[PDB]
Write a protein that binds this DNA or RNA. Structure first.
Ligand SMILES: Cc1[nH]n(-c2nc3c(Cl)c(Cl)ccc3[nH]2)c(=O)c1[C@@H]1OC(=O)c2ccccc21
Ligand SMILES: [Zn+2]
Length: 357
DNA sequence: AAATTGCCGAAGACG
DNA sequence: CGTCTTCGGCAATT
């Protein structure tokens, strides 16, 4: 039953080939345009991230995430109030003349200024693309992405995300996050935390507006690693090991949410990241591969559901990397919204998920 | 050195 | 199930 649903969600290789060919062409051309001189972004390097590259994209290969990461040496972070996730960015000394100087607000590196120039460069390069139907989506306030819309003729969206790369130790708000010590282990956790961390230009929302200069942490690289390396046993899902159902559970939950969001606009505040965060917590709670045997799929999905419902009820979903940051706080999502989603999930749960059709 | 190449894991396709 | 395939990621190579 869930097996038949998984069959429907599975991407098709011909669809993948057609989409990847086009997306790869467009991204490679923008990355190159960025390498151009003058460009304040000259040293940017590409990191593919998100559902498609984690192999948990469902239904159709029509959404691609790509981080353009820029190593910016020696920056100081100032936590924006007590959020743990959002920061003001300053440069330590003064780099004689360096080209991020235009994006400065005196001493602070404005996320909005830098993203605006990045978007402008992308829009200009896109207008010069003639062999492919592609346009830039209208700017979305408080979004770090420049979103491309490709018609292949199928509709494909590509989010291009500027990221600042910093090689220093991770901000202390993350010190008790990534609780993978009983699952993936201490050597993995330590090695993951020696990797760079990233800032993307998503502005903090304080009230009815955004704080234009704030940046937000991103662990898209770390999450991608975990999805590809998700077993307590090193051979989990390898050719000489045993298949588990962890990723299939994630797909089913993404599907349930997406089907619900598509017909109820009361759910606009939710997104796949909430589901991804929930299952990260589930994998920490139930680390044994034996707990995610494919024969147990139904019970794993149900336990994920029970857990997600408890998060909604209690208005608490801790960010997996930043435990202080509650994704389900009143400030971010209204009570009413969480109770609406609770009633809809419970109904689908007790009626055999009719919405899976 | 910016672009090419090689290798192989993940997973879709098929019987 | 096994086998065969393509795509993505990496980094040595030129
Ligand atoms: C609600 C939400 N939070 N969230 C998210 N918040 C993140 C935080 Cl705070 C850190 Cl530190 C790292 C990654 C994070 N991802 C998201 O990525 C989203 C969704 O991504 C969006 O841009 C978005 C937009 C509308 C609804 C949901 C989301
Ligand atoms: Zn596995």
């Amino acid at each position: 039953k869930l097996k038949k649903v998984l069959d429907k969600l599975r991407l098709k290789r011909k669809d993948i080939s057609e989409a990847a060919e086009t997306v790869n062409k467009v991204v490679e051309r923008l990355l190159r345009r960025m390498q151009k001189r003058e460009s304040e972004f000259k040293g940017v390097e590409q990191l593919n991230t998100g559902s498609y590259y984690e192999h948990v994209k469902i239904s159709a290969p029509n959404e691609f995430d790509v981080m353009f990461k820029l190593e910016v040496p020696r920056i100081e972070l100032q936590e924006y109030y007590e959020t743990g996730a959002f920061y003001l960015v300053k440069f330590k000394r003064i780099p004689r003349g360096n080209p991020l100087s235009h994006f400065l607000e005196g001493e602070v590196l404005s996320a909005t200024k830098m993203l605006s120039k990045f978007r402008k460069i992308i829009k200009e390069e896109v207008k010069e693309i003639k062999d492919i139907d592609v346009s830039v989506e209208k700017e979305k306030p408080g979004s770090p992405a420049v979103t491309l819309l490709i018609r292949n003729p199928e509709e494909i969206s590509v989010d291009i995300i500027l990221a600042l790369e910093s090689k220093g130790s991770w901000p202390i708000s993350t010190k008790e996050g990534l609780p993978i010590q009983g699952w993936l282990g201490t050597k993995v956790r330590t090695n993951l935390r020696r990797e760079p961390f990233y800032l993307v230009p998503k502005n903090a929302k304080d009230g009815n507006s955004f704080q234009g200069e704030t940046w937000r942490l991103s662990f898209s690289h770390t999450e991608k690693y975990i999805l590809n390396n998700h077993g307590i046993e090193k051979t989990c899902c390898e050719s000489s090991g045993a298949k588990c159902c962890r990723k299939e559970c994630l797909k089913l939950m993404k599907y349930l949410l997406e089907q619900l969001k598509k017909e109820f606009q009361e759910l606009d505040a939710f997104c796949s990241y909430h589901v991804k965060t929930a299952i990260f917590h589930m994998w920490t709670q139930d680390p044994q591969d034996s707990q995610w045997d494919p024969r147990n799929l139904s019970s794993c999905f149900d336990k994920l559901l029970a857990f997600f419902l408890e998060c909604l009820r209690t208005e608490k979903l801790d960010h997996y990397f930043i435990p202080k940051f509650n994704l389900f706080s009143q400030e971010l999502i209204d009570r009413k919204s969480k109770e609406f989603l609770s009633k809809k999930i419970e109904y689908e749960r007790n009626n055999g998920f009719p919405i899976f059709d």
